[model samples]
Target chain A: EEQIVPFYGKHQAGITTAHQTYVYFAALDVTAKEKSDIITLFRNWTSLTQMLTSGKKMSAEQRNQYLPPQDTGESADLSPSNLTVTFGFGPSFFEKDGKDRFGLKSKKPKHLAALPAMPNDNLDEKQGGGDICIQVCADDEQVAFHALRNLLNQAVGTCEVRFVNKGFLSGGKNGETPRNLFGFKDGTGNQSTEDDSLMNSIVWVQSGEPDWMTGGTYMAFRKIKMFLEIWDRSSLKDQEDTFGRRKSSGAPFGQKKETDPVKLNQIPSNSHVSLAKSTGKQILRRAFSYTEGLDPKTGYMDAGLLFISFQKNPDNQFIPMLKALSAKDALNEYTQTIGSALYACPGGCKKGEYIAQRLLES
Target chain B: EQIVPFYGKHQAGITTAHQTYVYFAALDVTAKEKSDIITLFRNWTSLTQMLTSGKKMSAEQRNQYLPPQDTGESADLSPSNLTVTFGFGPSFFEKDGKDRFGLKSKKPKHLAALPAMPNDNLDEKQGGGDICIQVCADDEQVAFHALRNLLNQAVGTCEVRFVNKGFLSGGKNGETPRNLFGFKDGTGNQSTEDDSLMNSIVWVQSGEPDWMTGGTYMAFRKIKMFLEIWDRSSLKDQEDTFGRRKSSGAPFGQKKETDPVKLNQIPSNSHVSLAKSTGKQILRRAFSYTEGLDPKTGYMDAGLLFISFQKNPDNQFIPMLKALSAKDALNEYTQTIGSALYACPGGCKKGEYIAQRLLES
Candidate 1:
């Protein structure tokens, strides 16, 4: 059957801050041809996949590493260089050296000492890297459901895993903007353009890295799952303090400043942000919401947010944030971080040179 | 709780053929108004009662008698001088000084004889008389069905009916013109306007009784039910025959002068024209299609043509057609004529002078 695919893209406005959860990740497949196909599949799948598939567990280590802390203290802002990939599974699988594989398999780290190694540890995993990232609008619940289903079906019946990690910022208005399974508004604090000077001071590298990479940046994605039932029973106030923002407003619990330093005293000690703060880490977040299996047996709506983020490095920036959130965040009641991945997004080149062309050639 | 009413009128096109079964029936009450509303409630009930509540039977005895034959010959064509009144059941009993009664106990003779009446009896048992008629291209089965339901609904609720049963002789490419039913092929054997002599001969006299004195002419309505199931089974063939002509052409089963008359011989015996021919009476006919019913219960998706005729007396023109159709008309397989009525329409007068002057003077 000939499938008609349609796509639309726009920068989310006022609503973006509260509901936004960014995930920045790159696929292990670095070949120019393979990456191009992967990118195409991502674009195609975003128009099709359900939001539930987008929400999965991301490791605390992966979350912190990918969505590193924004040293520049500002909320309502997004991280630089957050590129999102949305794709579906394709049927044609070329043999890789001697092994014939149809889909990606899980890639595990070799040793505990070098836990964050980039090349050796990062391979096509069964769960983490699929050809697509289906992006759907979170406005209408029905449309979101259909779009996700379509993307999943497009994968051509391959058993692939999904990974989601939050970027920066808190939930949207009505606390309905988007929430991870953890039930916490993911990206409560991010820097705005006005804080360009502070971002330069914190995220930008002074001497290292190439000249072309100045404006461009890198992103990462990790899949996280939340225990939704427990989150539902918590009082509204308790839920709000965990994320350190009003359910409706991304504003701090009592303060008005967009990037005000989170008051540790007012917020609960066990809150997601309080714990993340202890580690002194931050990253720009852009996350998607998903509702998957309705427990026909139990009659519960099973769904969560697909978390994605972006940052300059996977080591110093991302690790600390993961440690804080995972330790004893109040949000731990209803969530589990599952899959993890880190990809390098090459800087945008001039017209003559294709994206990542220089890196592939080298 | 709040009831508002709106009224509007539509005129038939000058170039429009007489085959158009011009239907005019009140909605009984607007969506906002309920049957409890005094003025509108009785309007439908009374009208139905008048047409189908009389104690007469057959063409020979009924106050409005038409011949028992189905032929295309007649002088009195227009079924004019029609007036419709309606009221709620309580109001009807109060005004007529009669007890509340059902159809079984106090059945009107005219309604009882409807099934046996010559030609198609297009009226049903309701409380009052509201004027209704069918103006068809040619007295055919489709036209019969069209007129049947128009009267049925009008009587069932409180509504008025009228039709200008003229012909469509000036049709395009030697084919019949369509009417209100959205049928591409409809009126074939219509009267031509260019022929003033024929027009004068077919037109009714201006002088008559007080009720019909100024009315232009008379029109007839024959309500016939269509066999939707059978028709749907052969949609391809139905579309070819009924849907091929322009809006002025006769519906399926109608035969033009140039073509051989394919009457009862057609594969689908329920072809419209065949049924009217079996009745042995011919009247200028037109019709409209209506489809509605609570799908949960009745599942009724069929409607009518609102057929009418303008002959001097229905006795001469209506009976002959009824006799012919009685034997073996294609219309029998699908349709059943429900009611018949004779009305005296008032002439064209402007403003309040039309109805007020008639009532006062």
Candidate 2:
């Protein structure tokens, strides 16, 4: 059976949807000047997203031979495969430099700014920073890519993709935690997506934000490149001590199971888990691994984790944890932050309305 | 449920059942002597068997300070029907007038770099390698893990020249996958179930080198599709370019996908018609690749990792590619940006390393 996530709700689906096998994340710079044009783009995007998630062709009305095909057609045979398209507005969406480009500069949230520089930060401008972003996830790689492609096709001239990255989830079968390139189980401490109470407290922006963004959340992205060759050469005990978990069971130093409670004092102070847990803050971890062939400058494999986390406010939750990890986590010896970005996603809309409509029209 | 046998009459990947993903690597061997190269193969044989069976390369109870025996990314994953195949290129024997491993005399007469075709814009870095390994598995991570471990073991013996990670959709329901051009590929090709046809077209015969009697030749073409151009063409033109119905993958005049190819009914310059005209066949085991945007033109860098296996390159692959590159209408939307050819030696039995006969004779 083909799975189809709902597109119209109080909140976006991807934030709570079960992790898919593949993701095609894209960042685009908006070139449209007028407020009306931005509204029009979102309206079309809403309709297109509805059809795309439901496995319908972009052009359902008629077929015109002379004109270009409405859909890419490569994924015609594929089902929706639980596809979900999530849209977010970057800081520049509200204002650029000192100018109010769209008259909505005052509407920007307090926490919607570029991230502060963290330890070991080596950012690439080509791979990050955009006025808009589209996160497409699906169980099928082609389906995920098709949604991004066709959406860009419709947004031609209005916006162009400034950067794109593809990530994937593999090997975590039957509800098991998936391992990273470093062979450690990632997302082992993430909260359950079904716990609405927990999500309300940690993930959704309930108060202190404008009404239009009540059900939304903030997204923090980091392109962390893992040095696999160095890690592969490290000792088993050294690898385990770095992650604060056993290689076999992903358990804490003295625990028998991954679900066991963490004993902070038992593991090394500089271990990734110990530092992350010491912050006493939580962010919804949703990350995928990427392998981008070889690095031209270095002969090592150009691969790493496409780290993504969702939270109500990055300043309080995501930022503090990242600061600790970047500062002294032993894993940093083999990892480098190559790219980073943060976006503010607005709440979902009804059938007739478009995404971010409340903000644009108010 | 996940294992694929490593010891066989012929290498596993060539005629084995299809998997969903492939990590195809072209490596340049760095070993200095023939004995070192032989030792590397022996090590690979044992390691490959363990990998396909979903077992770790070594036990986890190694020294606390020494490097771990195996990279553990694939620790808890299933093999997902993994297949690892190895091959030798012309340069593996001789490069720049020097016989690196003293393998020049044993090289097959036809094992050489592909000649320039009608439209080849080859990137020197992408073209040739001393050796090749085709790792196929249903899970993307498993395929990647296999190649990573293999390369780790060959750290000083060899290094990667290039790696192409590819995938195919529609394989779950047993349907043909469409290339980036939106045309169903490998529609007219023979199936793996047809043993007689495979023996005739894919497997090398006797009277050749004893070491290569059961082996086949592999031809690789990294064909880059101009999706931006192809998308704008009319639906009719797209169909004409492939000489098939876009909906059902049937030949121009046929009704269903299974209908036989009628060359006369299709355009003379159509891809299918040109390929059928060759009067030869090659088992097409290719995968589609999408490498994100091309920085130069802001276009999608997506295409097919075209792979084919045949008994003889001169009789099957070479002539087929020549004919199609010369006149195939599909060429307008595609170009061969990378090319390589390798002579994969016959498979090994228990206790024998891959290409053992050729190396030890």
Candidate 3:
């Protein structure tokens, strides 16, 4: 059953890995009150996900014809297809309703609270926080859905889905910057996850405050709503100028090569690339575009990009970049930040160790 | 920048090659005047035509500070394999003792809400609508963007109430796409290309309301398949439930899809035989759906979204459904979660709008 990506690692599988073709990022609210119950739930989840990532059935595939199936059966014929299931903990798990439900309030990281509100934000609380989160990515749609659906099924007694968003790339390839609902290519300014030195500096936590968070990192998410009605009416040159990149080739305004150095003066002072570079520090940007459905209030589309970025410390990196963009980014005019959240992902579970074992068993 | 077959006698989707992706939205009209509602349709028509032609929503716009005229997600994409179909819910003509558009009397007798049937466990969440548009395309982005743009175009007149996304399978079989149950769907469906066949099976004609002349009735059922139980079932039992072989998609005692139905040889209460008893010809264009995980059951809340086009729903669709509901063995593992009926009034000309007759009358 072993396929492309191993489910277990010193670092979680999805952190800086090449973006998958499709993703169904789910946030789940835990129902169990006892901390042990959550651990028990994840213990079984760990094994189940291992089998899933290996593209094997959780149990036998023999058709019983009389009883309920252990597996969903949709991915019976599929390969693992490079599926990755990454887990993280939200602030609410540390403390929610002003109570320390898990008795781990003291372990909360310094920057684990919700992202600070910025301009053009319409954050919906219902779509925001969760007790736990999972990012499921795969090359095939069915494979991705199949993995998450089965995992949630096993989580029946302990958790329920808080928010679910599905997204995929259009005309994109590995190592390429994917386009969002906006025509311009995204994450062109992101730091490379391949360089250990770079990741150690900007991504992997080396000397974080808590011992359990030594190798752990911070993550931020935003459900950005693209105002297509507005964006669709703009001129192509204007769109290009707004993002300061060519649509077909994601080069800087004055540069043709994707990797060529930026011309700081070519794009708007507060344009997308301009503000992103202002941060100086980088975040490993891994985002996907989503189309949930229709928006009743505006009768426009409820679709946009599900932006996710990982950094050694989001407060110092991602947060400041967002502040800059909110202040004057031209792309802000056609988009709304409808949902936002922050989470602390512990170092990957070692062999025989469940995810976040260090903190959970502390 | 290219893809063809964007225009024809009718919309290019229904009879054309099946697409893999689908997204359906049901909109409820907010406009009070018939003229305004008609104008919404015209705007939607113009936009949809352009999209199918592989053209941008606005090829020319100057100020980039303003939002673009189109979503641009599908820019430089394809259109040949895409189709957008719109319909009217029963409430579109008359609702709450008000015929907002002078359309109360023009409502077709067959164009109404679905009636209650046997063993129906209808989940209200998936059913009902005032206006419905289905976007099917080969590319997922193209399909999603098309539906969103069409919804955007109707900003003032209507708001979408419900949305469902599903996928259709592509196989060599004619009129038969693969279902999640691992069987060919609509294997027995008849064609709608010839006028004679179309008249008998799909199109609305004289004697009904004048506005409904070229229109057809579209019935939708969002059937939720309990895969947990079905996946464990023995091949014999599963096949009997369908009354067809899983691999060949042929009825019992027959090896080919085209083999004539012999009710006596198949299970009396099987889905295939019970459905065949109605003897009413219908054109089915169904897709399989896999969505949200059911935390309580530890399984996918997946199923089939069946779409059928017929001349008369009361006689052709409703009765056949009634027969299957009463006797089909497949009912044990499936629940009819959502159901609705719409009037898919004929196609529009290149310059005219869709469903124009309903408003002018």
**Top candidate when judged by DockQ against the true structure:** 2
Better of 2 and 3 by DockQ: 2
lDDT of 3 by residue, B22-62 (tens): 88888888888777887888888888888877765554655
lDDT of 1 at B292: 24
lDDT per residue, candidate 1, B1-361, as tens digits? 1110111120121113443223232222212222323232233233222222221112432221232111111111122212221111112222244332221222111111222434544434321233323223222212222333333333334433222122222122333333222233323333535434323323334443342332322333344434333223233333333322222233435554334345544433333443334332223444433322223323222334333333243443445345434543334323444434333234322221221212232
Ranked by lDDT, top first: 2, 3, 1
List where candidate 1 sits over 4 angstroms from the true fold.
A1-125, A130-186, A198-207, A210-214, A244-260, A295-299, B1-361
**Selected candidate, larger TM-score, 2 vs 3:** 2
Instruction: State every prediction's TM-score relative to the real structure.
Output: 0.33, 0.97, 0.78
lDDT of 3 at B243: 78
Q: Per-residue lDDT for B225 in model 1?
A: 38
TM-score, model 3 to reference: 0.78
Cα lDDT tens digits, model 2, A71-147, are 77878777888999998888888888878899887688779988888889898877877998899998888788878
Off by over 4 Å in 2: A57-62, B56-62
Q: Residue A53 deviation, candidate 3, in Å?
A: 3.4
Report the number of the highest-lDDT candidate. 2
Model 2 reproduced share of reference interface contacts: 0.60
